[PDB]
UniProtKB/Swiss-Prot annotation:
Family classification: Belongs to the pancreatic ribonuclease family.
Keywords: Disulfide bond, Endonuclease, Glycation, Glycoprotein, Hydrolase, Lyase, Nuclease, Secreted, Signal
An example Gene Ontology biological process: defense response to Gram-positive bacterium
EC numbers: 4.6.1.18
GO MF: lyase activity; nucleic acid binding; ribonuclease A activity; RNA nuclease activity
Species of provenance: Bos taurus (Bovine)
Subcellular location: Secreted
Coverage span on the entire protein: 27 to 150 of 150
Cysteines paired by S-S bonds: 26-84, 40-95, 58-110, 65-72
Catalytic activity: an [RNA] containing cytidine + H2O = an [RNA]-3'-cytidine-3'-phosphate + a 5'-hydroxy-ribonucleotide-3'-[RNA]; an [RNA] containing uridine + H2O = an [RNA]-3'-uridine-3'-phosphate + a 5'-hydroxy-ribonucleotide-3'-[RNA]
Record protein name field: Ribonuclease pancreatic
Binding site for substrate: 7, 10, 41-45, 66, 85
Glycosylation positions in this chain: 1, 7, 34, 37, 41
Subcellular location, principal: secreted
Amino acid sequence: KETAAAKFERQHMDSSTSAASSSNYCNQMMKSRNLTKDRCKPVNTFVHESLADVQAVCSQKNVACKNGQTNCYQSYSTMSITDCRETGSSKYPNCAYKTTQANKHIIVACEGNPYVPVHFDASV
Ligand SMILES: Nc1ncnc2c1ncn2[C@@H]1O[C@H](COP(=O)(O)N[C@@H](Cc2ccccc2)C(=O)O)[C@@H](O)[C@H]1O
Ligand SMILES: [Cl-]
């Protein structure tokens, strides 16, 4: 029902803020992106850059993906990201997350035409 590209934007793009403002960011954002619907998604990263800047990573440093495919790309620049990780006491359907704001390089896998991110591989 959802393209891979659209799922990437839903799970990983938050161009509306420049950083997580509070320790409640992940709690709110995981819910509003439907990442707590059926189960609590344990770990998820949001990127606080323009979509154009993130899509441009598909023309930057080509690297292998964790799965061994070679359509992964590392951002040349660091980007503003938020890492969201469920707490050890979190239990569905009251999913709870720790927020960690950082500036890091992102690694995404790209596919399709237009050649855009379809997977978030890691931050470094
Ligand atoms: N080279 C490839 N090209 C095309 N798609 C691929 C490739 N590698 C993995 N995917 C797939 O893209 C989907 C979206 O992933 P995400 O939900 O964005 N990332 C996982 C993290 C992850 C990191 C490494 C490996 C797996 C998971 C996550 O957010 O929890 C996942 O279901 C992957 O199987
Ligand atoms: Cl992978």
